[PDB]
Paper text:
For example, there are significant differences in the annotations and even in the sequences of particular proteins. This is especially true of 30-kDa lipoproteins (30-kDa LPs), the most abundant group of proteins found in the hemolymph of the silkworm fifth instar larvae. The 30-kDa LPs are involved in many physiological processes in the silkworm body. They transport lipids in the hemolymph, tryptophan metabolites and pigments in diapause silkworm eggs, are involved in an immune response pathway in an antifungal defense system, serve as the source of nutrients during pupation and adult development, and are the second major yolk protein component. Bmlp6, as a 30-kDa LP member, has a fold characteristic of this protein family, classified as Lipoprotein_11 family (Pfam: PF03260). Thus, Bmlp6 is composed of two domains, the N-terminal VHS domain (Pfam: PF00790) and the C-terminal β-trefoil domain (Pfam: PF14200).
Here we present the crystal structure of Bombyx mori lipoprotein 6 (Bmlp6). Bmlp6 crystallized in space group P21. The crystal structure of 1.8 Å resolution shows five copies of a two-domain molecule with a typical 30-kDa LP fold. The N-terminal domain (NTD) of Bmlp6 (residues 1-91) consists of six helices forming a right-handed superhelix and packed in a globular form. The C-terminal domain (CTD) of Bmlp6 (residues 92–245) is folded as a ricin-type β-trefoil lectin-like domain. The interactions between the monomers in the crystal lattice are weak with no indication of possible quaternary structure, as established by the PISA server. Specifically, molecules of MES, isopropanol and fragments of PEG were mainly located at the protein surface. There are only two potential cavities in Bmlp6, denoted Po.1 and Po.2, in contrast to Bmlp3 and Bmlp7, where three cavities (No. 1–3) are present. The structure demonstrates that Bmlp6 differs from Bmlp3 and Bmlp7 in the conformation of loops, the electrostatic surface potential, and potential binding cavities.
Numbering used by the authors: 8 to 245
Write the structure that this text describes.
Amino acid sequence: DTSNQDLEEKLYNSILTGDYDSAVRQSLEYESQGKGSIIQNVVNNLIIDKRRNTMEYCYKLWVGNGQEIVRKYFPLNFRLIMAGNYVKIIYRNYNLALKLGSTTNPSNERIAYGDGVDKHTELVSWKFITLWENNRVYFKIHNTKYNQYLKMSTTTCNCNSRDRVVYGGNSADSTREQWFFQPAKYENDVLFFIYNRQFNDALELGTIVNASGDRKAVGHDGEVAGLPDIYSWFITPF
């Protein structure tokens, strides 16, 4: 009886309010009834609205018998993220792939960069590991070559004068070693803003550091969601 439009509204509301168990139940029911278009429409609208809760919805489907729904109705990159596939993480603005540098500091940590050239070797391979906590999905961003996790400094102050350099470290148990994503649609692509769980700073590429055109990776100070052309990332298969 209830129209597909009204069910879309109910589903969107569930997701926005963080009632993921209702969202998953609804989604399974709609797909079983051949009304999967409801899910497609909600995913489209969530992304147009740049809702971070899209990630949670995807995750909860992924672990809640909804893997086929994820495959069918979300862009490919969502499955790459939830399935833990090897990926490249490429900055939209400069088209540079994320890597870690070759030297370690006394804390045994590497500095993160966008590579000026490389889009192919193991140097730019990553995978994501999910963590569900506080009714939210977070990501540990794991570097294949060096077996380290993307992070911000775990020794710096929790204050406005913090170190904003992005590093790689051996573990990912701290909120500073964890990240959350916000999707956005720009031109034909679904891209992601990637934010540090503890600091809320968006992952950004700053100034050029060498002749090959590498750029430093840093945490941005301020809102970025209006500018996916400047501050978002592509996630593509490695």
